[PDB]
Design an enzyme around this catalytic site. Sequence first.
Site, PDB file in Angstrom:
ATOM      1  N   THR E   1       0.535  -1.422  -0.003  1.00 34.43           N
ATOM      2  CA  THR E   1       0.034  -0.205  -0.379  1.00 34.43           C
ATOM      3  C   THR E   1       0.912   1.199  -0.137  1.00 34.43           C
ATOM      4  O   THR E   1       2.437   0.943   0.781  1.00 34.43           O
ATOM      5  CB  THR E   1      -0.802   0.096   1.543  1.00 34.43           C
TER       6      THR E   1
HETATM    7  O1  U5Y Z   1      -2.967 -11.996   4.078  1.00 30.73           O
HETATM    8  C1  U5Y Z   1      -4.687 -11.956   4.275  1.00 30.73           C
HETATM    9  C2  U5Y Z   1      -4.904 -12.811   4.861  1.00 30.73           C
HETATM   10  C3  U5Y Z   1      -4.545 -12.456   7.025  1.00 30.73           C
HETATM   11  C4  U5Y Z   1      -3.561 -12.491   7.752  1.00 30.73           C
HETATM   12  C5  U5Y Z   1      -2.706 -14.103   7.555  1.00 30.73           C
HETATM   13  C6  U5Y Z   1      -1.155 -14.311   7.975  1.00 30.73           C
HETATM   14  C7  U5Y Z   1      -0.639 -13.147   7.699  1.00 30.73           C
HETATM   15  C8  U5Y Z   1      -0.971 -11.951   7.798  1.00 30.73           C
HETATM   16  C9  U5Y Z   1      -2.521 -11.244   7.520  1.00 30.73           C
HETATM   17  O2  U5Y Z   1      -0.251 -10.855   7.704  1.00 30.73           O
HETATM   18  C10 U5Y Z   1      -0.811  -9.762   6.534  1.00 30.73           C
HETATM   19  C11 U5Y Z   1      -0.637 -10.834   4.991  1.00 30.73           C
HETATM   20  C12 U5Y Z   1      -0.422  -9.672   3.928  1.00 30.73           C
HETATM   21  C13 U5Y Z   1      -0.832  -7.957   4.083  1.00 30.73           C
HETATM   22  C14 U5Y Z   1      -0.950  -7.763   5.419  1.00 30.73           C
HETATM   23  C15 U5Y Z   1      -0.726  -8.806   7.044  1.00 30.73           C
HETATM   24  C16 U5Y Z   1      -1.223  -6.815   3.382  1.00 30.73           C
HETATM   25  C17 U5Y Z   1      -2.321  -6.963   2.827  1.00 30.73           C
HETATM   26  C18 U5Y Z   1      -3.199  -5.678   2.654  1.00 30.73           C
HETATM   27  O3  U5Y Z   1      -2.836  -5.754   1.433  1.00 30.73           O
HETATM   28  N1  U5Y Z   1      -3.238  -4.387   2.857  1.00 30.73           N
HETATM   29  C19 U5Y Z   1      -4.163  -3.361   1.758  1.00 30.73           C
HETATM   30  C20 U5Y Z   1      -4.885  -2.694   2.512  1.00 30.73           C
HETATM   31  C21 U5Y Z   1      -5.038  -1.527   3.403  1.00 30.73           C
HETATM   32  C22 U5Y Z   1      -5.488  -0.891   4.029  1.00 30.73           C
HETATM   33  C23 U5Y Z   1      -7.042  -1.678   3.576  1.00 30.73           C
HETATM   34  C24 U5Y Z   1      -7.302  -2.417   2.888  1.00 30.73           C
HETATM   35  C25 U5Y Z   1      -6.217  -3.044   2.274  1.00 30.73           C
HETATM   36  F1  U5Y Z   1      -6.779  -4.522   1.514  1.00 30.73           F
HETATM   37  N2  U5Y Z   1      -3.385  -8.331   2.747  1.00 30.73           N
HETATM   38  C26 U5Y Z   1      -4.034  -8.677   3.510  1.00 30.73           C
HETATM   39  O4  U5Y Z   1      -4.485  -8.781   4.883  1.00 30.73           O
HETATM   40  C27 U5Y Z   1      -5.278  -9.679   3.386  1.00 30.73           C
HETATM   41  C28 U5Y Z   1      -6.203  -9.059   2.381  1.00 30.73           C
HETATM   42  C29 U5Y Z   1      -6.937 -10.472   1.821  1.00 30.73           C
HETATM   43  O5  U5Y Z   1      -6.439 -10.837   1.061  1.00 30.73           O
HETATM   44  N3  U5Y Z   1      -7.997 -10.387   1.585  1.00 30.73           N
HETATM   45  C30 U5Y Z   1      -9.306 -11.486   0.761  1.00 30.73           C
HETATM   46  C31 U5Y Z   1     -10.823 -11.307   0.928  1.00 30.73           C
HETATM   47  C32 U5Y Z   1     -10.451 -10.386   2.208  1.00 30.73           C
HETATM   48  C33 U5Y Z   1      -8.891 -10.058   2.187  1.00 30.73           C
HETATM   49  C34 U5Y Z   1      -9.756  -8.485   1.814  1.00 30.73           C
HETATM   50  C35 U5Y Z   1     -10.129  -7.308   2.710  1.00 30.73           C
HETATM   51  C36 U5Y Z   1     -10.659  -6.335   2.536  1.00 30.73           C
HETATM   52  C37 U5Y Z   1      -9.693  -5.505   0.793  1.00 30.73           C
HETATM   53  C38 U5Y Z   1      -8.913  -6.631   0.337  1.00 30.73           C
HETATM   54  C39 U5Y Z   1      -8.701  -7.561   0.340  1.00 30.73           C
HETATM   55  N4  U5Y Z   1      -5.537 -11.039   4.069  1.00 30.73           N
END
Ligand code: U5Y
Lengths: 222, 222, 223, 222, 222, 223, 222
Positions: E1
């Site tokens: 991000t």
């Molecule tokens: O990776 C995951 C699973 C949770 C997890 C497990 C183990 C370690 C970990 C995080 O540790 C992590 C793994 C990965 C990250 C952080 C921590 C990066 C972060 C990100 O991209 N964040 C960008 C972002 C910023 C602000 C708001 C929304 C948003 F997506 N990604 C994430 O958390 C991902 C997100 C994802 O795939 N999904 C699919 C359906 C719902 C969820 C989503 C919700 C809302 C909007 C877009 C997506 N979850």
Amino acid sequence: TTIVALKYPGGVVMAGDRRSTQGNMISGRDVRKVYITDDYTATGIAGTAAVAVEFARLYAVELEHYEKLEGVPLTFAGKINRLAIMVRGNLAAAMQGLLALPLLAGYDIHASDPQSAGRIVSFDAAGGWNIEEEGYQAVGSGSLFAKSSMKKLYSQVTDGDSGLRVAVEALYDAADDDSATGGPDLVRGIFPTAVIIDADGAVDVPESRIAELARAIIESRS
Amino acid sequence: TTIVALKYPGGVVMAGDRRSTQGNMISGRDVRKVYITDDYTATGIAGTAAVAVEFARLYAVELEHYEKLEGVPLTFAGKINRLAIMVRGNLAAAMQGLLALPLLAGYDIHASDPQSAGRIVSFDAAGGWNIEEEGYQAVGSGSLFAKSSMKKLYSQVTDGDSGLRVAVEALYDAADDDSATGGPDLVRGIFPTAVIIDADGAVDVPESRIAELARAIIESRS
Amino acid sequence: TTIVALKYPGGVVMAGDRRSTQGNMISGRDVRKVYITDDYTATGIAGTAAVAVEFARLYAVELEHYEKLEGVPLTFAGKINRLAIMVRGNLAAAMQGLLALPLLAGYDIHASDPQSAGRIVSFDAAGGWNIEEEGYQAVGSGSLFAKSSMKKLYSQVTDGDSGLRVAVEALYDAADDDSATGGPDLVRGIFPTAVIIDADGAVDVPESRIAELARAIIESRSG
Amino acid sequence: TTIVALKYPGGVVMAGDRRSTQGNMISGRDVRKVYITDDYTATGIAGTAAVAVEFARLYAVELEHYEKLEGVPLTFAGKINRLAIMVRGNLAAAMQGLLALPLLAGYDIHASDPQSAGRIVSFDAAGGWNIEEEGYQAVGSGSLFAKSSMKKLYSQVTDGDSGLRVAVEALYDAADDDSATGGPDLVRGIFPTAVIIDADGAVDVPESRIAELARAIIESRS
Amino acid sequence: TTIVALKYPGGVVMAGDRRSTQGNMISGRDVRKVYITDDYTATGIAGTAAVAVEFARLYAVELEHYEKLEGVPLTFAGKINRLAIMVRGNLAAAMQGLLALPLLAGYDIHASDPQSAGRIVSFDAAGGWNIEEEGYQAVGSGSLFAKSSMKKLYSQVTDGDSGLRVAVEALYDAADDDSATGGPDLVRGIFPTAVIIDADGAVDVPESRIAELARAIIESRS
Amino acid sequence: TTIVALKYPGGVVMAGDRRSTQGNMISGRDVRKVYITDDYTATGIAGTAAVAVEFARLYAVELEHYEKLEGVPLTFAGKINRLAIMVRGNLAAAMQGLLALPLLAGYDIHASDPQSAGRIVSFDAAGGWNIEEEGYQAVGSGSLFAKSSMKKLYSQVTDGDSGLRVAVEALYDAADDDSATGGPDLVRGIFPTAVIIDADGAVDVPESRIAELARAIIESRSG
Amino acid sequence: TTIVALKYPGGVVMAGDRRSTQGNMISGRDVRKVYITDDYTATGIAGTAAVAVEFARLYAVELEHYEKLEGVPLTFAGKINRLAIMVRGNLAAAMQGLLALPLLAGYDIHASDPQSAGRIVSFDAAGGWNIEEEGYQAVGSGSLFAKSSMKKLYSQVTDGDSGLRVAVEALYDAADDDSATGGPDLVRGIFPTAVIIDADGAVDVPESRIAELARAIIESRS
Ligand SMILES: O=C1CCc2cccc(c2)Oc2ccc(cc2)C[C@@H](C(=O)NCc2ccccc2F)NC(=O)[C@H](CC(=O)N2CCC[C@@H]2c2ccccc2)N1
Ligand SMILES: O=C1CCc2cccc(c2)Oc2ccc(cc2)C[C@@H](C(=O)NCc2ccccc2F)NC(=O)[C@H](CC(=O)N2CCC[C@@H]2c2ccccc2)N1
Ligand SMILES: O=C1CCc2cccc(c2)Oc2ccc(cc2)C[C@@H](C(=O)NCc2ccccc2F)NC(=O)[C@H](CC(=O)N2CCC[C@@H]2c2ccccc2)N1
Ligand SMILES: O=C1CCc2cccc(c2)Oc2ccc(cc2)C[C@@H](C(=O)NCc2ccccc2F)NC(=O)[C@H](CC(=O)N2CCC[C@@H]2c2ccccc2)N1
Ligand SMILES: O=C1CCc2cccc(c2)Oc2ccc(cc2)C[C@@H](C(=O)NCc2ccccc2F)NC(=O)[C@H](CC(=O)N2CCC[C@@H]2c2ccccc2)N1
Ligand SMILES: O=C1CCc2cccc(c2)Oc2ccc(cc2)C[C@@H](C(=O)NCc2ccccc2F)NC(=O)[C@H](CC(=O)N2CCC[C@@H]2c2ccccc2)N1
Ligand SMILES: O=C1CCc2cccc(c2)Oc2ccc(cc2)C[C@@H](C(=O)NCc2ccccc2F)NC(=O)[C@H](CC(=O)N2CCC[C@@H]2c2ccccc2)N1
């Protein structure tokens, strides 16, 4: 331990072995592992002896407790749920070696078709429950051998007597391959126990019948 | 496993069960654990199947190797020492789970009295060895049960046949209490193996003789 | 496990396989993983069997509990949030092996455009939720095979039946590459389950139509 | 993986599935796990793919190496010992996840009785070897389902074609219950491979015959 | 991000990318990370998606909660302190991978100098807050590339429109060097989101204008 | 990384992306991951950059070393064996993080049927090797997306040019779903590299043909 | 530490800062990190000071050793491979904290035209090497800031002197955001060092020219 259960036209059969162990050492030859939980249900449990016995005893009390409080027995699905919840609540202890793995056999008096009203429900250590639909199931260290034996033998099941014979033969194959499952003991005259449930309720199978079937299997394979 | 050895007037007998396991699962029913290692010596080995078999094979080769190189067989004490050195060399592998515990029986042709030329020698995982002076010994997971059985029965050992009977009964008692020791299989017709050694050398005991004694023991117990 | 969900003009489809496993061993062949959670909502869950079935049953009770207490069903966004909060509350147990990953398909009765009123929401193990806008989604060990299959097949989705066919073929591709996902069992007569939701509500798809589509996919690939 | 092997009057048959996996993901559908290692010997290997393939190629080279050096092939016992030593030498790598678990089928040209000259030898990760005397054996993650299947079907083995049918049905049963063992793929036309060995030597079974047997099994179960 | 925020004459702009990842895999393409928190306040959050979403939602209800209870919105310092307290309360979970890092942009209607009412506040995982005075700031895995891009381009910020173009170009540079930040998607037609805040309040920037600036930046790069 | 390999009538094509990363940070935009290792062989390698480059250079030197010492090139099986042994010899370092996974494409001049003389061989970290008989294979972080894409597109492969296009589209799908696989960079004019191998030997595909195919793909998907 | 390097038409520049630290404490203010290791190559190394210094001296000796042995200097590719092998060989010590990351700027006398003879090669801790084609590169704790600065300033590079100005400004931006990179010291008169390489070879850039460019940057931003 091996405990088996199988459906036959109009009922269900559950049978279990008699062995308890403490490591490689045999610590029990007379264990009764298949309990008549209520008039239409039988429970068989593998795992740690202390927990398995407590599970069977507590579960029967819980079922009768509801029936007396409410004037009607639980639906069979309610009985499934209460056993699953009991196993789920034991999960932490199960991770510490206090494991109980039940197998549930029953006859649903509220099912539509009484010919198929028999029920078999297997469980896992997380409290998962799965109503079996292929006619038989087994639990315990010998359950793989018993399920594979029953796979080849289940076509012979046409009534209660042949269902009982197949159940006893599966327990025989399990003990043949799993040292933690006890075979028939001809010297001591100790044989697997069995419960059969139909529309008239659950009854313990007389030892003499199981002795007859056990000796026949032994005679056949010699 | 259980291996028993006992002395009778004029010789020794060693007998062993037929079972191999992997955890709870039975993986073998006809294992031969008692080896004639030379004309006057038998070895029985418990522990990890791979190591036990290799020990027996390599030991017999080593004894015959010396005899051919020098024109005379090792003294019995020399045979003991070589077996102990072999066990001692495996100690690190034994601590990693590759264990072999032998039991040695023999007839010492260079002994003073021919009737007291029988020898029984037990070993431990560190290569320790002890010449048994009290008439019998056993090795394996059922050895304590077999030795306590022999403690009560040894008084009836008066010749080779009664020695054999007591050895077979001791193995029966070990199988009765130790799930890692195989009992007589009357269905498959598989029985403990036995070697008897006297001044005429070491010979395998025919299975028919062991089978008859095992059935008589089973009949007496019923 | 693989659960799939896709939008078609006027509604949504959700389908799921029938397998459970313990390690390498197959432990179930007719598991039902796609639940009608209310009249316009379907939920499909992957992960630990015990937790998955408990999530579905509790979630359906929670939605009906609100409807009966307040006289009105939850808004679709309210349904999303309750499902997400349920997943979030399980995060600790999920890290210890009691994982439940749901997928949500629904028909929003209060949406603007009735032909775009289909909804698909994916979740993660931390209680994250994301409303999908590209028309399809999947969850489970075969979900990447299914999504990449639906990526190439989605264009042929013009109504409910063609949407069902694509969902079944995605599950077929998932089971083709993932041993933890079950393919159609022609010897036993066991096929994936499916739910279709439109303006008239959520309905189970009869086993016969899924069986016909599966056989069509099968012999189309065998030649 | 499941590799099965069984004895029939006059020879042996060995058959193996075609699947390779990386955890849950299928990474191979046409793998050949049953090798003709010399003119009277076949080896089927389960475990880590890289190691299994290496073991087969090196073992076959080792046997032919000895034959060309000495002018005669090894005895079957020598062939066993060589494979066992190879497995034993890999024990440390196998403990690190580079496991190879072989199963050996052969026809002993030097046996006095050609009707029973078939041989089946199983192995374990420590290099232990056991000549199977109950007529069938299996290896791999589906071997227990296969062995419990062959237990109920083996009495139907009267010639090479009945033995081949039982071996294919055993593999079918293993794949039915083991997701790491591949069932017959009618869509792709990929079926288990098999080798049959009699006095005339070892020969690959044509895929058409195995396909016909698979279709018969599948239609029977339907 | 990457979330960027920069001050222009009489206002502030905040823009954010649209990507979510699960490790290497792209899991979202249209995530909206810039929230209008109240009439004069916007927050952009990076980190674990679930925690970031929940943070923006709960922060907005807390600010409006105070306004409705007390009849007046919080002072800008009060809004900062509540957002900092929320991050501080998440610290333990943030150390386990449930991290939310917010960036706060706003227009202080109670500012001392009405010409310089723009406000940018950055935070750390411990709840620390710092009112930024050098005109721009960023947060997320591309914040360093975005801040270094803005260091060179900020001299071009003369009104709201040029400030928007610089913010979008900073996001473009962050996506250029950071695979976890998403760049403009001309195939799907997806572009960063932006919010602009001046004396007339905070409004969402139309997608058509952002797309225009993004296309111009792309053409100037190629 | 994603490397794809693809059999077509009379040869094979192999293509690879251009990105290298350090965590989330992009560290390279024009890496060439597909190496012509001799006149009838190409190898693409995913994993640790230093190790992958070492592997390609040393493997090429080894194959030519044998050819000059013995006056004939190795059989294709021999080439497979040497690559497998090189990967197996690196297993210890690979467990420490110095990982390299190769994919082998080649044209076997000694094959019976020249039309199907193309060969794709995949490898694992333990030195395992498997000759792919289904016509395509992929390696790297995006290989599953690429294989699922080629599964749907492979029927279009009738000659070298349609095979090259499918390969480029698979790499496009992989980059679409995997941030560790770089997509076509129209701003910088950087596109995947590809090698085509037929009976007349191996040859690099000119960037212009790949740019043409990438632009056609991007246009078709943009509507 | 920040070391930058840039191509310009017909040559190459490399510059580095003068700071060494032990944690937060500054330990050196006049460290020279850019070495003329060859008549047409310079090397700048970040990391542990002892290892960086040793790497420079040994690498230069090695290249001159080959030249005197063979009479011809190594091809530029050979100079790359030798520096890569040296870094790979240090990998074990680098994991223990004895890290050296070099950056190579050369002029290839054997290149096609003098305008494209400049060479930039970046290395990683595993011994990886990459010929940089985007015209500039940096190494050290401030390399991200310098690379982003150079991304904005590189369009101004038309000759060695504008390249040198951009190099000093990149280093100025690195020191502006990275406390481990030293800025121009006007009090002591210490400035970044620089090496320019063209067809005439490698030349140490005079300090006075660097000081002019530093003061112009400092005034331009005041
Ligand atoms: O990776 C995951 C699973 C949770 C997890 C497990 C183990 C370690 C970990 C995080 O540790 C992590 C793994 C990965 C990250 C952080 C921590 C990066 C972060 C990100 O991209 N964040 C960008 C972002 C910023 C602000 C708001 C929304 C948003 F997506 N990604 C994430 O958390 C991902 C997100 C994802 O795939 N999904 C699919 C359906 C719902 C969820 C989503 C919700 C809302 C909007 C877009 C997506 N979850
Ligand atoms: O081994 C033990 C020691 C207790 C223990 C603690 C923690 C972990 C653990 C075992 O680790 C374990 C060790 C052993 C097992 C599980 C866990 C197997 C299990 C078994 O045989 N179970 C068969 C069985 C099934 C259902 C009902 C009764 C029954 F014996 N055996 C056991 O628990 C044995 C049982 C045993 O020796 N005794 C002697 C007197 C009382 C008790 C008995 C009760 C009732 C009937 C027959 C015997 N306890
Ligand atoms: O369990 C195994 C695998 C090796 C292993 C792995 C991890 C821990 C471990 C042992 O740790 C162990 C696990 C189990 C044991 C020891 C150590 C008990 C021991 C035993 O029964 N030993 C009885 C016995 C004694 C003497 C001679 C032969 C003989 F079988 N069992 C064993 O080693 C079993 C033996 C076994 O299944 N097979 C099948 C094919 C070949 C081999 C066999 C050879 C020869 C004769 C009969 C069988 N190997
Ligand atoms: O493996 C187990 C035991 C619990 C356990 C122990 C250790 C680790 C672990 C899980 O960790 C795990 C081990 C295995 C998994 C996850 C986690 C895969 C998962 C699955 O297949 N899940 C598919 C699925 C999805 C939705 C609903 C039902 C359903 F089976 N399997 C499981 O949890 C399996 C399920 C299983 O064998 N049984 C036998 C009878 C009851 C239970 C069942 C319930 C309901 C339907 C079908 C079967 N339990
Ligand atoms: O999983 C891997 C990677 C190595 C590895 C890493 C970590 C743990 C581990 C093994 O530990 C393991 C993980 C998984 C296994 C074992 C060990 C199961 C085993 C298997 O299916 N084996 C069946 C089989 C039996 C005999 C001969 C060939 C053959 F594939 N699978 C494997 O080793 C898989 C195999 C695989 O995907 N590939 C792709 C191309 C090359 C290789 C292949 C070679 C030859 C034929 C078919 C495939 N490698
Ligand atoms: O991250 C690093 C440092 C080594 C390292 C440390 C810790 C963990 C680790 C790897 O573990 C890893 C970290 C990262 C990876 C693997 C392992 C991914 C891998 C990659 O992109 N691999 C794609 C690829 C494939 C074939 C050929 C080249 C090529 F880049 N990236 C890498 O190794 C990166 C590569 C990198 O930044 N540089 C800059 C200077 C030269 C080197 C480069 C060489 C050749 C081409 C392009 C770039 N090295
Ligand atoms: O801190 C130390 C001690 C060695 C050490 C121990 C434990 C961990 C560790 C490093 O881990 C580290 C701790 C600190 C660093 C790296 C690793 C940063 C690094 C640096 O500034 N490096 C800049 C630099 C780059 C190239 C050439 C010279 C040069 F100083 N600092 C260092 O190594 C410092 C250097 C230092 O103080 N001195 C004082 C007298 C001589 C020595 C010096 C030599 C040559 C030139 C300038 C100074 N050594």
